[PDB]
Amino acid sequence: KVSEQLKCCSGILKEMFAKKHAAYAWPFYKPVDVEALGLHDYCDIIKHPMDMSTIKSKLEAREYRDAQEFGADVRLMFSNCYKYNPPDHEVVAMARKLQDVFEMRFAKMPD
């Protein structure tokens, strides 16, 4: 019942990583390198960081109870990006582009 969906969740993330949606998903692959990007304030603002590589590990480690918990992390990822950056920022525009893909697939998941 639930294991059916959790495997479909993996299928979604694979498409998010895929070269098809490469142009506007590349910031969200790995964690936010505060050193490289030089974001001293980031850790104060964002209490719970998240990225696609982190979510990938949790799926393989069976750390999500159900498909609903998987979504929360994917949404947290974009939520953090929206929270930190201003509306007209580039990463935000890309965040929306990738999210609109996720939302389409997560909505059309069978049950």
Binding site: W26, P27, K30, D33, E35, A36, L37, G38, E90
Partner: protein, 149 residues
């Protein structure tokens, strides 16, 4: 303009590593070509940097603005990452001329207004007052780049 970064918006993870005794000042040429100074790197230190594909860099001394080398060259331009591996930028001293190296020492020990209180030849006053400039060095490289074509 000739020497300028390309607004690619394509990621390129870099590692600046100050393997020199100077306090390095990373300088980034913007999309128009105007240099932007970034936070300094202490001697014998380094850190990860998130630059982008086709972005010009150059490195100087934070104090004296002396020219340094990065991978046995003046300008640094990141490639695209292979298997997401970081592009290293080994910042080091050049082999300074005995004259230019002597100037650097005199410059550091004597103020600009005390240059004409030194028991030296007239010509050396101009040489001392002729400090190392970034904009001046970029105008040379631009002309050398044109000569190469």
């Amino acid at each position: 303009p000739v020497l300028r970064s390309v607004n690619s918006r394509e990621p390129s993870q870099v590692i600046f590593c100050n393997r020199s005794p100077r306090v390095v000042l990373p300088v980034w040429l913007n999309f128009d070509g105007e240099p932007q100074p970034y936070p300094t790197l202490p001697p014998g230190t380094g850190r990860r940097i998130h630059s982008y594909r086709g972005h010009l860099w150059l490195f100087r001394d934070a104090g004296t603005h002396d020219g340094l080398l990065v991978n046995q060259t003046e300008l640094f331009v990141p490639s695209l990452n292979v298997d997401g591996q970081p592009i290293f930028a080994n910042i080091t001293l050049p082999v300074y001329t005995l004259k230019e190296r002597c100037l650097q020492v005199v410059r550091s020990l004597v103020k600009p207004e005390n240059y004409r209180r030194l028991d030296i030849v007239r010509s050396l006053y101009e040489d001392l007052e002729d400090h190392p400039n970034v904009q001046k060095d970029l105008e040379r490289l631009t002309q050398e780049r044109i000569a190469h074509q």
